[PDB]
């Protein structure tokens, strides 16, 4: 039931949906749980936008209760490959992997609204079979655990032995505590 809109450039009467009128202003929304179908669309939006004008800013407008691990890195790498600069904004919530992207923005452009929340925790998982199939999964998941905490340390500023200890659990944060922890740079008013 998302409405339609009418727009008139020179000829006039061209009718869009409301999510495609923002993409004409270089905005991308992310308002769902991250799966593999959602990431293939975001990856294709960024590359389309970086082809018309390769020197123009982009925005991302996060609000998500997390999701997969692979799909998030598929976006973290595409944001670093392209030439333009990306900026990130939190709206309401930023869970498991949304917070790995909110900190991945450009240094100096990472905003947030006054009453928001930020959560960080270590990965979940699962395993089943016989004794040789478990020693493998338990060896993969720890390498992921040690890969993410090496990125957060350089993005935020904190040392590594603090990130290994702080998470361990579900750890909620407001918009003012995060400004000191190092996840963001400014608050909007």
């Amino acid at each position: 039931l998302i409405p339609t809109v009418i727009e008139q450039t020179n000829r006039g009467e061209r009718a869009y949906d409301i999510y495609s009128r923002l993409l004409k202003d270089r905005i991308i929304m992310l308002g769902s749980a991250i799966d593999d179908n959602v990431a293939n669309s975001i990856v294709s939006q960024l590359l389309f936008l970086a082809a018309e004008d390769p020197e123009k800013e982009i925005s991302l407008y996060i609000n998500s209760p997390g999701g997969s691990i692979t799909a998030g890195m598929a976006i973290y790498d595409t944001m670093q490959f392209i030439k333009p600069k990306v900026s990130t904004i939190c709206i309401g919530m930023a869970a498991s992997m949304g917070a790995f992207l909110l900190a991945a923005g450009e240094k100096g452009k990472r905003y947030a609204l006054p009453n928001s929340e930020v959560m960080i925790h270590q990965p979940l998982g699962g395993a089943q079979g016989q004794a040789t199939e478990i020693e493998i999964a338990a060896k993969r998941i720890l390498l992921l655990r040690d890969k993410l905490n090496k990125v957060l340390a350089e993005r935020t500023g904190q040392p590594l032995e603090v990130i290994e200890r702080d998470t361990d659990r579900d750890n909620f944060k407001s918009a003012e505590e995060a400004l000191e922890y190092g996840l963001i740079d400014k608050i909007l008013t």
């Binding site: 202003d25 270089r26 905005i27 800013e57 925005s59 900026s87 904004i89 452009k109 905003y111 909007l188």
Partner: peptide, 6 residues
């Protein structure tokens, strides 16, 4: 959300 993102 401008000024300044856009």
């Amino acid at each position: 959300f401008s000024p300044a993102a856009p």
